[PDB]
Amino acid sequence: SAFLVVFVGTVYVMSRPRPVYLVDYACYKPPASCRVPFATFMEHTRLISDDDKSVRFQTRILERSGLGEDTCLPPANHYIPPNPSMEASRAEAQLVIFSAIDDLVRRTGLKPKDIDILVVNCSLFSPTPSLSAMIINKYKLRSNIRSFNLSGMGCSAGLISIDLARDMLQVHPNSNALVVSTEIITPNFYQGSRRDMLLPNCLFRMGAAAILLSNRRREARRAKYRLVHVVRTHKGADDRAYRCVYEEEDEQGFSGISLSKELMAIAGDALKSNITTIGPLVLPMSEQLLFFFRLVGRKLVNKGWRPYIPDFKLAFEHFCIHAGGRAVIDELQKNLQLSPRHVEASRMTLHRFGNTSSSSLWYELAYIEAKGRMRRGDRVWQIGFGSGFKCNSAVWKCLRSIKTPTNGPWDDCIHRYPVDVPEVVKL
Amino acid sequence: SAFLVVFVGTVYVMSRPRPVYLVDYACYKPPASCRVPFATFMEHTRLISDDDKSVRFQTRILERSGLGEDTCLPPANHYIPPNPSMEASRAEAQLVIFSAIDDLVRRTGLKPKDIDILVVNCSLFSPTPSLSAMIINKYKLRSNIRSFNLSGMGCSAGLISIDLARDMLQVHPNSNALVVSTEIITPNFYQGSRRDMLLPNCLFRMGAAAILLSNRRREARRAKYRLVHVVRTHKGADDRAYRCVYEEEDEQGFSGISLSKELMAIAGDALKSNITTIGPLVLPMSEQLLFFFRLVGRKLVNKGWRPYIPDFKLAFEHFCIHAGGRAVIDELQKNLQLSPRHVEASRMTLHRFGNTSSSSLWYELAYIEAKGRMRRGDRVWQIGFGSGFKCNSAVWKCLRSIKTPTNGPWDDCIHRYPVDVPEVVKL
Amino acid sequence: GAVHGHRLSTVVPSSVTGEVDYALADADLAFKLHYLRGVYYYRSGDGLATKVLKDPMFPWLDDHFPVAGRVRRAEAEGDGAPRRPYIKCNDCGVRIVEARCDRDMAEWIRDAAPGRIRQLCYDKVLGPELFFSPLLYVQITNFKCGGLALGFSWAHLIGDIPSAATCFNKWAQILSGKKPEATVLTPPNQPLQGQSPAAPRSVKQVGPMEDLWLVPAGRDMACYSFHVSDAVLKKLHQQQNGRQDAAAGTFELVSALVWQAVAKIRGDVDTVTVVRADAAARSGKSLANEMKVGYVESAGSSPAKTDVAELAALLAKNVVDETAAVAAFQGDVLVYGGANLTLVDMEQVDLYGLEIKGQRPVYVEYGMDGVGDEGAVLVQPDADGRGRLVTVVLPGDEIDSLRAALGSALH
Amino acid sequence: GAVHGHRLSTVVPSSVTGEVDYALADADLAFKLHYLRGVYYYRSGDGLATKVLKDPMFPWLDDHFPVAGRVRRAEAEGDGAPRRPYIKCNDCGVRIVEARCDRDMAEWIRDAAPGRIRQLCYDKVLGPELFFSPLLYVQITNFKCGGLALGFSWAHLIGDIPSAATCFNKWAQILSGKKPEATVLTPPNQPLQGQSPAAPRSVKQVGPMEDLWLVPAGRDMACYSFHVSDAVLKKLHQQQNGRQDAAAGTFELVSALVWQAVAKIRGDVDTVTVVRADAAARSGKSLANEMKVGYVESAGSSPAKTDVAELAALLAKNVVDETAAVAAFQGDVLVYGGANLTLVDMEQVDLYGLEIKGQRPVYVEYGMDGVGDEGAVLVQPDADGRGRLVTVVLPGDEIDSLRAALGSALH
């Protein structure tokens, strides 16, 4: 036709969502004057406590956790009694954030007067003037800025902020959105001696990442990734999954995170109920035709067949499983059948940087960008899981092949990795 | 014309924003077994401290603060030394919230499988399983919910959650949004004796409000208001206005809010820079003609005319100034030249309930609803100001005239109000 | 086995009284230096947390809002010498002292050590901060065996002792879920003149005090509360044969017994004070001091070498009533223990009607404080209603000599 | 005026060493029970915070990575009676102990009180937690007047005294903005079996210790460090008239004077142990114990009645060398103060080369720990390069008799 093309060509172009790009992102590479080795940690925790049951548990945790010798702690856990103050934890928040945004505003040319949306997430530390107000005061941003400060949402709040800055870029056209994911280790230190609350002492390390999104069309040739899907899953309605990761107080009055002993049966449930909801979105139609077409041959033929999980290798090229521990990347490799090159960024990020809470996925993305394995057209899958057992997921798509020197946190030590990780660090 | 008509009638119906209605809201009325009179407070603080400079300051603060004899404190500041634990503060968050949503789901018939968005703001208290995860766990909501937990945004995060639930209801069609604004007073107590951190002890009281927003078309024969404008003004770029309300630790190691001495010269500049940017939105066209009809006679006739603040009494019929103190509402009455009847909810809410941090605007709205002064077609103005120097504002518009028995927080003492409040409460 | 873990809290009335001033009578200011100490022992403290015991005090203090007030002082427009106090009814509260003890309660009740009331009631007074001192402290201690001992320390300024026991019964009835009897506060107390500046010989006019309503007695006094059984009351009536008189043989017998036992120790208690808590002279008010203060002369032999029936016939007919001159006096008075050994008649008071839910109390004793250097005898009733419980406040030197002299009369 | 407020912290090498096992020499295990305490006093501590003093310790410990290691024990595949220790180079750390004192530093320098090095250096040892005991402690004391006293507690296992001082100067050269010399750890240490069971008579074979590398002395020790000026150093050269010998009169005169002053007190110290820290016998390695342990016999008259000149001539040619058999011994050795009075020759060592910015130190004294029951005499150089500073570590009963006897020579 020639006249019925404005009606079909108008209601379609006003129903499609505005595309959300990832222009660039900067991560914090912590200095070498803040690293905590294995023996330094096991000498500090042997001078702090007096009982032998609490140290032989931390040895068994730390020598099998998979961390390395370059994991960094803030400069208040380097004293033999750690003295976490409000000023000493705020001065670390001005170090991990302001040196990650200054890395971002010199590699993108971003003026600070151009940031319209600012989403900052941090689990434990949140002052009365928030971290978003601190970023506004440091960089002198606009007065009509949309500043949100999510807090208390656990280690999976890195993909809640991405979904928030995706939903705030559909309403407001032609805007830039700065997303800062961080974790302040200084008020997180548990002073007591309860054997189920010492697990956030041996895993959480320094790290922060600043992420710049936009929905302009000028930044569609300069951008790197285009966000395709964000799938959220909150298993907090279950009464045993709400109290799985739980902030309590012990018998002496020291607050800390109390991990339950049935966590790997709950973390294996929020993963399989988020993979189920993201399966029909990203799997190809040639491989989705063994669920609309094989399940007919169960209810009438035989209930109980050979176990056929759908292979997600034919849907993605790069996997970015959150580096929570060693006991969660093996179980997500075993039943999903991933090659050792697939779970390699998630292992070497845990080995080099440790369990950075919210921003581990961006170090895992910088690993794949640093080796030169991110070609043009690849799909990146980032999985996260948190404290109330939110288990969020995001699927990106690379727009242009990133050249091999990236000036990220990995470029000073990328000629050594991947190094072999031992099963037990022998002491 | 007959054919160039749907080309306008299909863009004007697709480019307009979705309306966001206010279906209903419920406010927490604290019981009579929690009230703190003037003499009880001045006996508790006289038995705790020894220096008579830390009680003769609180006497002069509390006897001129404007509060009354029915203001309530949580059941952990009723001990002579108050003992703020984490179980003692989590059991208050399960009281002011779970009884403000149980009141909301009984007057709207809200089935809990219909809440799609959930925004919960609370300034200081924020556990690692957040308050939104607690609300999801109690009422057994869905697993694909969009739960956000704003924390650390001060006393003006009540109109940030409204803006967030407004901007999330444009993206997701046919959804309901639960907005909970609260303040937990049990971890807000200050144990020290610094004479600029004692003002949050003498003002902050209990109170929470649960708010159900919805963008459906079926909620137009049942809703009460319609959200017209939300204006945000973040004055955090100035170093004076960022460190004005500040959370510190004193020399003995107690945390608390450190209010600066120049707060009245800073709040007076964040209010005049929010009234200025809301002026062209809400003022009538017969009053917006001082710009191109009178300020044209300001630049050449005489630099400096007689001072003419535009009166907002022709633009609004109801005012809901946040009950911060008595000195900030007398200042905003001299500026806009408000009547003594226009400032009645903002005074009687401070007199009855106190300075409930994030949710005083909803008690101020329930006052106007409970007196029978909310006619059909009236416009409500809610002003709020927080801690990074934010002063957010929101304009509603009433849809149906509310009858006088409302089952709100006022209906046992609304035959007694307004009362004559004195300048000095006698001691 | 000591009481530890004191947690203090307040309970205010549920209704805002406002700018109300309660005017104290001329008899309420003569009894302002004394204090009451009452322990109510319960067997099972099961079902009684420190929330179900604190929650009925919010409708209880609504009827009794002067108990939640504080003492203030009026202004002097003429001569600046008198400043009559008044209870300004600001809802300041009533202290609730949660505590716990690790001793067995049934062994501590039948222990007979000097001083048990001092640790279960909160030891306080209208002290150096007179404008901020509460008029009532309730100590709720839980024992190791499950016992419960409610310790009421009632200031004698605001109410009487039969105006305190019924004031606690009107809280126990609210706790049980009944309907309490309506309180009467509506006739306002008016000051009367009459210019009587002579000190009555039943009291001892102490020096003028201004900000500490407590006379330090000098000697360290202790509350020794022994028991008078049923078979000794019939053994006290065998000397009342061959003569008929108006001596009530259940107060004026055992009080004459303790009078003889204290006269055997001390030099000569020639005159004694008899403070009858009579029920016929009571008005309708629930907070008022309708006691009958008097004095009894010897008028003959010494009380040390005399039979008990003579000191019983003397204590009933030859009492000289002086409750009008004590209330018409202008200075500070100090009735209990000031001039002579007082003999309280708190025996028609219903102490065992503090039924919390359905539980009759096990053992109820009333001690005092602020008693002067002479002593006091508080003849209380027992749980069965046939025995008497005599609490003798004494300076401690005369306590261990009292148990030796009373051992031959109680067997 | 004592030190207070110790804040402990560690510093690690900046680069990961990997799994390297530093093997100790045969002379590195004879000196394992001794420790070195050296204080470096600075007059102006301006701009020298405890972050600018800690930041060069991360590149400095990259050159000297066995100092940040921990002692371990190898396994014996044959007979399991010996287990040779080694330094496992896990980057465990070096203690940084921030302290502060409220005394005047220039008054505490000229105090002559027995015991000052124990307060400014952190007194610890390779103790009962042997696998988790640091090999180096650095204590930074900020004085009231602005002084700075770095106290290095160095274990004698890993390095010598001239291998300690140049190792500290290689940190001060990194802090000062200079470029330090290259460290040499490249030839590894190998044991040589010589099957020598004869204990040398310059050392005293202490019993087999297993987990506490410290011999607790019977008498209590204290470090009295006096000063030998230039006007006495030319006075001692005037009894060498009429004879031209090899008496190098800045160590062999001073230490013979101290030998005579100690033999005046004690009974008969006929033999001594001269431990020369010679600079011509040093190999290229940066962490090794190339001392020269010997013994000098009197062979005739007592050293209490013999002049200083003859005791200098005796101490220069009659040194019977025994540093080859001490290292080849199998048990525990206890060189310093074990068998005889120890005389150390720490006078050619560049103590005052710790210029941290341009600040030459005002006073540098080196004491010891783990000295046996005989005594150690450490002849150190002065600030102006002309006098000798003599730190004498003796039992506390022999110090008050030493200052009186030594006053007749120094004046």
CSV table of N, CA, C and O in Angstrom, one decimal, chain B residues 65-71 319-326 329-330 333 339-356 360-368 370-371 373 409-410 413-422:
chain,number,residue,atom,x,y,z
B,65,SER,N,8.7,23.7,71.5
B,65,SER,CA,8.7,22.9,70.3
B,65,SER,C,7.3,22.8,69.7
B,65,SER,O,7.2,22.6,68.5
B,66,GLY,N,6.3,23.0,70.5
B,66,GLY,CA,4.9,22.9,69.9
B,66,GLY,C,4.2,21.6,70.0
B,66,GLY,O,3.1,21.5,69.7
B,67,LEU,N,4.9,20.6,70.6
B,67,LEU,CA,4.3,19.3,70.7
B,67,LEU,C,3.3,19.3,71.9
B,67,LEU,O,3.2,20.2,72.7
B,68,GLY,N,2.6,18.2,72.0
B,68,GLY,CA,1.5,18.1,73.0
B,68,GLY,C,1.7,17.0,74.0
B,68,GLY,O,2.9,16.6,74.3
B,69,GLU,N,0.6,16.5,74.6
B,69,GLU,CA,0.7,15.5,75.6
B,69,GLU,C,0.3,14.1,75.2
B,69,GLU,O,0.2,13.2,76.0
B,70,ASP,N,0.1,13.9,73.9
B,70,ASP,CA,-0.3,12.6,73.4
B,70,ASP,C,0.8,12.0,72.4
B,70,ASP,O,0.5,11.1,71.6
B,71,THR,N,2.0,12.6,72.3
B,71,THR,CA,3.0,12.1,71.4
B,71,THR,C,3.6,10.8,72.0
B,71,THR,O,3.9,10.7,73.2
B,319,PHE,N,-3.1,23.2,52.3
B,319,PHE,CA,-1.6,23.2,52.5
B,319,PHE,C,-1.3,22.1,53.5
B,319,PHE,O,-1.9,22.0,54.6
B,320,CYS,N,-0.2,21.4,53.3
B,320,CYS,CA,0.3,20.3,54.1
B,320,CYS,C,1.8,20.4,54.3
B,320,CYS,O,2.6,19.5,53.9
B,321,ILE,N,2.2,21.5,54.8
B,321,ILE,CA,3.6,21.8,55.2
B,321,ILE,C,4.1,20.7,56.2
B,321,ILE,O,3.3,20.4,57.1
B,322,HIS,N,5.2,20.1,56.0
B,322,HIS,CA,5.8,19.1,56.8
B,322,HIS,C,6.1,19.7,58.2
B,322,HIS,O,6.7,20.7,58.3
B,323,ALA,N,5.6,18.9,59.3
B,323,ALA,CA,5.7,19.4,60.6
B,323,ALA,C,7.1,19.2,61.2
B,323,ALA,O,7.3,18.3,62.1
B,324,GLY,N,8.1,19.9,60.7
B,324,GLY,CA,9.4,19.8,61.2
B,324,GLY,C,9.6,20.4,62.5
B,324,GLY,O,10.0,19.8,63.5
B,325,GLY,N,9.3,21.7,62.6
B,325,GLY,CA,9.3,22.4,63.9
B,325,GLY,C,8.3,23.5,63.8
B,325,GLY,O,7.7,23.8,62.8
B,326,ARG,N,8.1,24.2,64.9
B,326,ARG,CA,7.2,25.4,64.9
B,326,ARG,C,7.8,26.6,64.2
B,326,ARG,O,7.1,27.5,63.7
B,329,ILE,N,7.3,26.6,60.2
B,329,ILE,CA,6.0,26.8,59.7
B,329,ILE,C,5.5,28.2,60.0
B,329,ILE,O,4.7,28.8,59.2
B,330,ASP,N,6.1,28.9,61.0
B,330,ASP,CA,5.9,30.4,61.1
B,330,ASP,C,6.6,31.1,60.0
B,330,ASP,O,6.2,32.2,59.6
B,333,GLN,N,4.7,30.8,56.8
B,333,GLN,CA,3.4,31.5,56.9
B,333,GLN,C,3.6,33.0,56.6
B,333,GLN,O,2.7,33.6,56.0
B,339,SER,N,-3.2,32.1,55.5
B,339,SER,CA,-4.2,32.4,56.5
B,339,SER,C,-3.9,31.5,57.8
B,339,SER,O,-3.2,30.6,57.7
B,340,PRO,N,-4.5,31.9,58.9
B,340,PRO,CA,-4.4,31.0,60.1
B,340,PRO,C,-5.2,29.7,59.9
B,340,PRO,O,-5.0,28.7,60.6
B,341,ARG,N,-6.2,29.7,59.0
B,341,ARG,CA,-6.9,28.5,58.7
B,341,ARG,C,-6.2,27.6,57.7
B,341,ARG,O,-6.3,26.3,57.8
B,342,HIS,N,-5.4,28.2,56.8
B,342,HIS,CA,-4.6,27.4,55.9
B,342,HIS,C,-3.5,26.6,56.6
B,342,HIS,O,-3.3,25.4,56.2
B,343,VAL,N,-2.9,27.1,57.6
B,343,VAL,CA,-2.0,26.4,58.5
B,343,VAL,C,-2.8,26.0,59.7
B,343,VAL,O,-2.9,26.7,60.7
B,344,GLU,N,-3.5,24.9,59.6
B,344,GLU,CA,-4.1,24.2,60.7
B,344,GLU,C,-3.8,22.8,60.8
B,344,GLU,O,-3.6,22.3,61.9
B,345,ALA,N,-3.7,22.1,59.7
B,345,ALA,CA,-3.3,20.7,59.7
B,345,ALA,C,-1.8,20.5,60.1
B,345,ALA,O,-1.4,19.6,60.9
B,346,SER,N,-1.0,21.4,59.6
B,346,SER,CA,0.5,21.4,59.8
B,346,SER,C,0.8,21.8,61.3
B,346,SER,O,1.9,21.5,61.7
B,347,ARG,N,-0.1,22.4,62.0
B,347,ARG,CA,0.1,22.7,63.4
B,347,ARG,C,-0.5,21.7,64.3
B,347,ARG,O,0.2,21.3,65.3
B,348,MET,N,-1.7,21.2,64.0
B,348,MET,CA,-2.3,20.2,64.8
B,348,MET,C,-1.7,18.8,64.7
B,348,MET,O,-1.8,18.0,65.6
B,349,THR,N,-1.1,18.5,63.6
B,349,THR,CA,-0.3,17.3,63.4
B,349,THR,C,0.9,17.3,64.3
B,349,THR,O,1.3,16.3,64.9
B,350,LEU,N,1.6,18.5,64.3
B,350,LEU,CA,2.8,18.6,65.2
B,350,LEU,C,2.3,18.6,66.7
B,350,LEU,O,3.1,18.1,67.5
B,351,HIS,N,1.2,19.1,67.0
B,351,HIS,CA,0.7,19.2,68.3
B,351,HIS,C,0.2,17.8,68.8
B,351,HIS,O,0.5,17.4,69.9
B,352,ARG,N,-0.4,17.0,67.9
B,352,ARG,CA,-1.0,15.7,68.3
B,352,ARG,C,0.1,14.6,68.2
B,352,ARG,O,0.4,13.9,69.2
B,353,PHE,N,0.7,14.5,67.0
B,353,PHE,CA,1.5,13.3,66.7
B,353,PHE,C,3.0,13.6,66.9
B,353,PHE,O,3.8,12.6,67.1
B,354,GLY,N,3.4,14.8,66.7
B,354,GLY,CA,4.8,15.1,66.8
B,354,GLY,C,5.5,15.2,65.4
B,354,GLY,O,4.8,15.3,64.4
B,355,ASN,N,6.8,15.1,65.4
B,355,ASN,CA,7.6,15.2,64.2
B,355,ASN,C,7.9,13.7,63.7
B,355,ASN,O,9.0,13.2,63.8
B,356,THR,N,6.8,13.1,63.2
B,356,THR,CA,7.0,11.9,62.4
B,356,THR,C,7.7,12.2,61.1
B,356,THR,O,7.3,13.0,60.4
B,360,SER,N,4.6,12.6,58.0
B,360,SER,CA,3.8,13.6,58.6
B,360,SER,C,2.8,14.2,57.6
B,360,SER,O,1.7,14.7,58.1
B,361,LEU,N,3.1,14.2,56.3
B,361,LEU,CA,2.2,14.7,55.3
B,361,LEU,C,0.9,14.0,55.2
B,361,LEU,O,-0.2,14.5,54.9
B,362,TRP,N,0.9,12.7,55.5
B,362,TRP,CA,-0.3,11.9,55.4
B,362,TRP,C,-1.2,12.1,56.7
B,362,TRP,O,-2.4,12.0,56.5
B,363,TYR,N,-0.6,12.3,57.8
B,363,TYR,CA,-1.5,12.7,59.0
B,363,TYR,C,-2.0,14.1,58.7
B,363,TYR,O,-3.2,14.4,59.1
B,364,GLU,N,-1.3,15.0,58.1
B,364,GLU,CA,-1.8,16.3,57.7
B,364,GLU,C,-2.9,16.3,56.7
B,364,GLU,O,-3.7,17.1,56.7
B,365,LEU,N,-2.9,15.2,55.8
B,365,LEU,CA,-3.9,15.0,54.9
B,365,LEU,C,-5.2,14.4,55.5
B,365,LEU,O,-6.3,14.7,55.2
B,366,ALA,N,-4.9,13.5,56.5
B,366,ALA,CA,-6.0,12.9,57.2
B,366,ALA,C,-6.7,13.9,58.1
B,366,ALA,O,-7.9,13.7,58.5
B,367,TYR,N,-6.0,14.9,58.6
B,367,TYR,CA,-6.7,16.0,59.3
B,367,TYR,C,-7.7,16.7,58.4
B,367,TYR,O,-8.9,17.0,58.9
B,368,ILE,N,-7.4,17.1,57.2
B,368,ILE,CA,-8.3,17.8,56.3
B,368,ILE,C,-9.4,16.9,55.9
B,368,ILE,O,-10.5,17.3,55.6
B,370,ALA,N,-10.6,14.4,57.8
B,370,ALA,CA,-11.5,14.1,58.9
B,370,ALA,C,-12.3,15.2,59.4
B,370,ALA,O,-13.4,15.0,60.0
B,371,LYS,N,-12.0,16.5,59.1
B,371,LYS,CA,-12.8,17.6,59.4
B,371,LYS,C,-13.9,17.8,58.4
B,371,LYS,O,-14.8,18.6,58.6
B,373,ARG,N,-13.3,19.0,55.2
B,373,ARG,CA,-12.9,20.1,54.5
B,373,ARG,C,-12.4,19.8,53.1
B,373,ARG,O,-12.1,20.7,52.3
B,409,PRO,N,-6.7,8.2,61.7
B,409,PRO,CA,-6.0,8.3,63.0
B,409,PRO,C,-6.6,9.4,63.8
B,409,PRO,O,-6.1,9.6,65.0
B,410,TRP,N,-7.5,10.2,63.4
B,410,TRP,CA,-8.0,11.4,64.1
B,410,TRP,C,-9.4,11.2,64.7
B,410,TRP,O,-9.8,12.0,65.5
B,413,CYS,N,-10.4,12.0,68.5
B,413,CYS,CA,-10.1,13.3,69.1
B,413,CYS,C,-10.3,14.4,68.1
B,413,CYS,O,-9.8,15.5,68.3
B,414,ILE,N,-11.1,14.2,67.1
B,414,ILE,CA,-11.4,15.3,66.1
B,414,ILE,C,-12.5,16.2,66.6
B,414,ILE,O,-12.7,17.3,66.0
B,415,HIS,N,-13.2,15.8,67.6
B,415,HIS,CA,-14.2,16.7,68.2
B,415,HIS,C,-13.5,17.8,69.1
B,415,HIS,O,-14.2,18.7,69.5
B,416,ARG,N,-12.3,17.6,69.4
B,416,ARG,CA,-11.5,18.4,70.4
B,416,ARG,C,-10.6,19.4,69.7
B,416,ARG,O,-10.4,20.5,70.3
B,417,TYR,N,-10.2,19.2,68.5
B,417,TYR,CA,-9.3,20.0,67.7
B,417,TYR,C,-10.0,20.9,66.8
B,417,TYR,O,-11.2,20.6,66.3
B,418,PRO,N,-9.5,22.1,66.4
B,418,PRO,CA,-8.2,22.7,66.8
B,418,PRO,C,-8.2,23.2,68.3
B,418,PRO,O,-9.2,23.7,68.8
B,419,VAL,N,-7.0,23.1,68.9
B,419,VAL,CA,-6.8,23.6,70.3
B,419,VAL,C,-5.9,24.8,70.2
B,419,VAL,O,-5.1,25.0,69.3
B,420,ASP,N,-6.0,25.7,71.2
B,420,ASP,CA,-5.2,26.8,71.4
B,420,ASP,C,-3.8,26.3,72.0
B,420,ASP,O,-3.8,25.8,73.1
B,421,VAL,N,-2.8,26.4,71.2
B,421,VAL,CA,-1.4,26.0,71.6
B,421,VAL,C,-0.7,27.2,72.2
B,421,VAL,O,-0.9,28.3,71.7
B,422,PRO,N,0.0,27.1,73.3
B,422,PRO,CA,0.7,28.2,73.9
B,422,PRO,C,2.1,28.3,73.4
B,422,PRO,O,2.6,27.4,72.7
